[PDB]
């Protein structure tokens with residue numbers, strides 16, 4: 368409310384968790400917007416759209432994409448968002464090897480943690496944090512986007528949908544089939560993304576759940592009861608899992624300082640209970656000299 | 666638990682914003698509290714039939730009450746609103762929601778699929794897509810963490826009491842979910858263990874036994890009169906071992922406040 372008459376489509380940007388995303392222009396105010404188009408001729412309004420709209424209408428924060436309007440209905444549903452610049456995946460694809468400086472990385476992680484802390488404090492799990500669902504503007508901001516796979520959770524959690532999270536970024540408690548997962552799954556994903564920005568390659572690029580697990584184990588060590596109490600009783604744990612020694616973080620992420628390595632390790636802790644919360648992470652010494660650098664224009 | 670407090674604060678804020686209009690039934694020319702009781706009782710059976718979460722039930726009722734707070738509905742269309750609400754709650758809350766055709770099925774084919782889908786849209790428009798409502802259930806699960814120690818009978822009985830509250834818009838429409846949850850928890854705790862609304866929760870919630878008294882007196886009476894109520898689906902449900910047979914427990918005769 369809101370009317371499609373006032374928008375001029377510019378181009379298709381791509382496809383999200385659901386729907387199709389277009390760049391467009393408000394003809395009256397001049398605002399450049401993103402439109403997420405959902406075709407209703409498929410069972411009524413999809414649960415993904417119902418959840419994203421409901422949750423995004425609640426979440427007003429500088430590091431969460433701004434949902435401006437919902438235009439309904441014409442056999443089509445359109446979500447109208449503020450338009451930024453580019454998603455982080457495309458940014459990284461467009462960046463020269465030296466094109467993403469450590470101060471920009473620090474700033475991006477700091478802001479993603481703020482956005483995530485806000486979600487979690489408002490009982491929302493995102494459950495699909497990966498570079499493509501993160502959006503940057505030209506002024507140094509990064510925002511969480513695509514809440515199509517998100518859900519409003521309870522205290523304490525019940526069992527929710529199993530997998531959940533695109534594989535490379537999926538937490539070991541999900542892979543091992545735990546009946547309960549909670550806010551820690553989003554932190555795992557951000558830890559993976561942090562490593563990926565630093566080294567410019569995916570931390571754990573598996574092609575199946577077992578491949579994904581073994582990749583995680585080769586880096587972090589195969590988990591046991593000492594490191595993660597209860598692990599050997601989890602549904603998809605196997606006594607036959609190969610044993611690998613934990614790697615040194617200086618070798619996992621060479622460009623990273625001591626504080627950076629410390630934060631990464633806390634974000635990739637096996638035990639979701641010990642894994643750092645987004646809120647506690649904001650006060651980590653890594654962020655002592657954080658600023659807000661600008662990215663390149665691609 | 667790094668967000669327990671943050672989340673509870675937020676839900677307290679949202680429950681005020683998500684609260685239906687206390688006096689709406691008097692502004693409905695064709696429907697009544699009695700017909701609403703019939704509807705909600707029916708949704709309990711639907712929830713049982715499709716093994717839906719209790720939370721889903723609480724959500725659908727919130728959606729119905731909010732919808733009826735601004736939309737006049739004829740008695741012939743009340744079940745349609747309820748069906749569309751249950752479909753929406755299921756989509757929001759359930760891992761595997763029942764298909765639309767299954768919701769068409771349980772209306773005994775009074776309404777078509779197209780009507781159910783059109784009502785879904787209307788409900789969404791009227792609620793402006795704001796479906797993440799706090800429920801009695803969401804407060805109860807948090808309150809349960811304050812048990813010393815945890816008691817399965819207390820938990821199911823509190824859930825049973827909170828669910829009974831859904832049936833009777835007079836008086837429960839005037840109480841917030843966090844208050845009904847507090848009254849339900851106290852009364853469950855008292856019935857099973859003799860214990861009382863504990864100090865850790867007085868301090869978490871700001872609610873005293875005294876502030877809970879008005880709701881607690883009503884819920885007490887509801888609990889005592891439960892076997893005599895015209896709607897019985899919640900009592901029948903809570904006989905099941907799934908809920909530890911708590912509807913077979915005897916209500917205490919006095920509360921001694």
Ligand SMILES: O=C1N=C(NCc2cccs2)S/C1=C/c1ccc2ncccc2c1
Nearest residue numbers: 381382383388401448449450451452453513
């Ligand atoms: O960017 C968005 N991405 C979404 N899901 C995954 C996709 C990434 C790229 C295409 S689809 S929903 C979404 C909305 C949105 C909002 C603002 C934007 N600003 C600049 C570029 C893309 C934007 C997308």
